[PDB]
Amino acid sequence: MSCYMGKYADELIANAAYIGTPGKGILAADESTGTIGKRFDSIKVENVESNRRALRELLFCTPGALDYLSGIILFEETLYQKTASGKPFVDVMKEANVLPGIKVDKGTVELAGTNGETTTQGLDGLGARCAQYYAAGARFAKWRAVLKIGANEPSQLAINENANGLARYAIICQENGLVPIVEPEILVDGPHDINKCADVTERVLAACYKALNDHHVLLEGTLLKPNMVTPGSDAKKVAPEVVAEYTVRALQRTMPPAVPAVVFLSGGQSEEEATVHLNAMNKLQGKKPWTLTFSFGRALQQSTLKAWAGKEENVQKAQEVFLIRCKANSEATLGKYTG
């Protein structure tokens, strides 16, 4: 009943540690075919593989953006793709000491007997898939569990299924050489206030680290990708300083210091809100024995996508916009962002 000490142990610890290099974060480019569909429909562009490969090439080969990124999450298609000039995307990455990552979950399905709660699909054959993704150069993975806040939600059943789902996924990843990003996402939907989301977050995160210990996960080779602690979509916002204090407090109360880094998700926050919130947290005095950095998708890309508008002429101005967003957030991980 020891935690994972298998052949990948040292590498899992090293690579997890690297993801938490201060000043670096994670680019989430692991959108589905469906999700990038609406990302392309806002820029009035058709969802063809050529246009997806183009956007990925556009991001990954922005001059200098890979100074600010420790890892990039890929959809499986992209893991095997190349630049226009025939260079594998993973080779571009390995040369800039960026780690490639892969989404391995299979989305959500409703839990029988609940009021719209979800469990997450994917454990079937997960070990075989993970060994194949490592052979292709991936070094960390991502799995997304979803929980909702309501009258009786999250239910006890919801919390156990997602916590033990995540722990089961994490230990299979580690056995096949991938650092598992543990993502317990609590949706902002609803009229609750920041205190109710503080409690739900704390209960859920405590449920997850118990499960990880129950399943013998080596915490020093893991990462955590949590929501920030915020009021509901339908409640009045609060100052960014308040969000920071509630969020770092939930983390202090639940997350073992052995876990090297938190890589926040932004939800539906504006590009600036996310960067501001992340800065305010690294400015707080208090115990923070883990890196507080980003894993942004929409929150890094949306302005770049608009400047590009699917045109080749616009590559130059979109890449500068993306390079600025990478510097802003890298400064936010250091407490040095100023608006």
Add this chain to the structure above:
Amino acid sequence: MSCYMGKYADELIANAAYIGTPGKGILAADESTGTIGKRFDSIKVENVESNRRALRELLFCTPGALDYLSGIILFEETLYQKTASGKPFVDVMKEANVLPGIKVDKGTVELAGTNGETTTQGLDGLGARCAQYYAAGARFAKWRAVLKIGANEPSQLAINENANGLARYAIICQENGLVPIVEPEILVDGPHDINKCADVTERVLAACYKALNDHHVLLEGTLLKPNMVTPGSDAKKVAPEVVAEYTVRALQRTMPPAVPAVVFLSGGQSEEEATVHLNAMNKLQGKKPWTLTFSFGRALQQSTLKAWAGKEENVQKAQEVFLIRCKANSEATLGKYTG
């Protein structure tokens, strides 16, 4: 948080009870292609679809055998197969008021960090597969969890994973019209005695019904397929009467009376050992608020297969052999078998 109250509730209840009509039990003819290949390799028979179809038609079309059977468990291939004369196998059964059943699990994989313990795969896409199997005429399902007895085994982790795996499976079945057979098999391997197996069985069965309650399963539309309580592989055997008492007691201590029937598994027991034990239990004096019947594979087929030897000439004698085992076990469900 009530238990399943959906559209299939009444049919699940009637079909579950019907499986327990006295004098009838279940034929497990649900070996996979891999599995049936090593049965065929023992009688030097080719493992091609035409031989698999012939074996199953020989069984299902034994004159009179379906008087003694309430259900038959099929592999997905066989569910869609026909008699030589063009009759779908499900039509053969439905005409003899036999319920067709379908195996829905995808085998076992080792649990990371344990000493050779297993979890069972299959939940990914299970609901769709079940809805498809219902339309093809199946009315109950089977999922097999495996637990072993050792120094520190079954572990607490193994017990929760297999018990919540069964409950997660059971409720998905009920939403799609299949009566779930809950099968927690404790392997006989080892030098332990009958009391160590009595303890482990009681612990495991208690874990499973607690899980089923947590997941809101409708117990009146379910069934149980437990091991009998027996000494280990490597220990001296005990009289069939002792096996009977320990087994009925374990059930008395754990299984709610709302569950209509038990369909015992035979493990590696001889054809006769299985029948004797099943008879000894139905003769035992004591509270038995559930039918004690069979769900046998090897213990109905092994001699029929050896007699057939894959030839069309041997069909008639092999069918006589098969009908003998179906009558004997039907008597054992009534306490009227006499050797």
Add this chain to the structure above:
Amino acid sequence: MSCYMGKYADELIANAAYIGTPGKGILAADESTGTIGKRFDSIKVENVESNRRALRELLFCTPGALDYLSGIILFEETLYQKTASGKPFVDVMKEANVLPGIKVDKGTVELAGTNGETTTQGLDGLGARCAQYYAAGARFAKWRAVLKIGANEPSQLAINENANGLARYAIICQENGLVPIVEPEILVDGPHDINKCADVTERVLAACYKALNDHHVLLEGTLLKPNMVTPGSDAKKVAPEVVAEYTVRALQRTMPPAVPAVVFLSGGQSEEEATVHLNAMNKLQGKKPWTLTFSFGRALQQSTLKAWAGKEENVQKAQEVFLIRCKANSEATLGKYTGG
């Protein structure tokens, strides 16, 4: 990781089963000083030990009443008390093949951080106290856990604390020779309907039998004292047959057949309501691998206490009233009560 196989195993099984003898039930006469002080003030009777002893002798010595009782639950004071002529109360019972029982919990206290939910106190020194009551002639015990039905109640914390409290209590009884009555009472307070109390009852019973298994309790030497499944205090009542079918269904889905008997609590039901409900349950078609009998307190004694009014002259007709209620409930356990 065997269930209880200690020296008292055979006796616990014999005595647990005996409680479920058909036609017999349990008189709950285990009111505290405080509690009996609050029915004594309703009949204008001073609450001093000699009046408590007089009431208990009136009950226990009703001619013929112990034909209908397999056990009687006592408060600790009464365990050591005697009839006026000097015969110990336990000896009165032992002569009538009645088993004396003892309340062993120390009441409820609020659960920190919940919304008015409770746990039950009593585990400290329980083993010694039970060993002492056994030598004093007790053969079964009683411990009461309480749960409420509200917006978010019963909570997961409440369910876990009361279920494991009951289980830890149960195994201590068995080690010291007492048959444990497991009583998880779900209060009727509130506007919920009968379906909401079916769900909570099924959830709570499943929790208790899992906890009981975790703690290695010998189920054949235990008993269950559950609420009947009913609509809420503030909701419309339904026909007694409905209460019966819902209640017997909840049990079917959760209570193992090894437990020999159910000894229902009446809560705030009228004396008649309790007997009607208990009769309707034993008439039902269905699987019932356990005795469905009573453990009634207020529901056996309310009219007897009024008839007495604390007077020596009224003892005769008070004992006649109590024998009628013992007869009615004894019929109800057989499906043969016919009104009145």
Add this chain to the structure above:
Amino acid sequence: MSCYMGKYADELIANAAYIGTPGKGILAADESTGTIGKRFDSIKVENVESNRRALRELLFCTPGALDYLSGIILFEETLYQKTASGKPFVDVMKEANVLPGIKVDKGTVELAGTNGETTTQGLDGLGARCAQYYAAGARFAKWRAVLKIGANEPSQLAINENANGLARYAIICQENGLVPIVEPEILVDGPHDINKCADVTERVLAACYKALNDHHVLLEGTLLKPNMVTPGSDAKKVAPEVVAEYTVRALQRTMPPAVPAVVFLSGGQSEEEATVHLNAMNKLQGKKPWTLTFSFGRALQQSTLKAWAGKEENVQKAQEVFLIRCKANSEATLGKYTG
């Protein structure tokens, strides 16, 4: 389902932090009559109230020793006792900014069905007692759960009973104004090696902090009193540096940074071994977001009792002996002890 938000919250937080002031630790002088009778039996001293009151005044009134102490754990008798000159012991402490603490558990009893495992008594009336101790000047509490390491131990039953006992005790303390010290002691008894104690310690600590979250405890107003991670009593010892690394690793993997301090128990370790280990841990490279300090009984007192031998003439040389142990351990918490 918020954690403790009552009137005592700010005070509980301030004092728990105070317990971890650098350079200070806790003197455990909470021996019972029975226990101190076994210390006195060795130095041939009569076990009567005036000799107990004398030993405690000898400790609490050593010139300079309260510079090295943030708190002192008392037996109930001593909470109400006075100096020879009539000054309450609580007043002596309050004047030197030392916090009085009180033991609130009622010892252990065996758990039925285990092989000599224990649960801990004390919850009955705990709230009333804790409120009386507060008005008497106590500000933190102590409860000792015990776990042993064997073939099948610690058991799942043992771990749940002791983890929930501590959490149940923890929240009652906070409601009545006492900082709860959570003490899950894993006994050193046996031939196990240091890795088996690392595994058992990690499992146990994980259960307690989940139990603590279940019961809504305010972690920032608690303390932890864990065993150090060591081989078993009956096994060959390892270097003090090794004990340090295994011990700090066990905590990093389980203890949330919201808890302000660790107050180590010494077990049966010699006075010098305890000080060496504690110094070695504060020298270690690594994340330590919590004070690593002491809560020592025998390991501060044993040589002082021997010098005293229960005589009034010997007070001066014994107090010198006690002051040396208080400075070594005070230096050990700061990495400065040098022999």
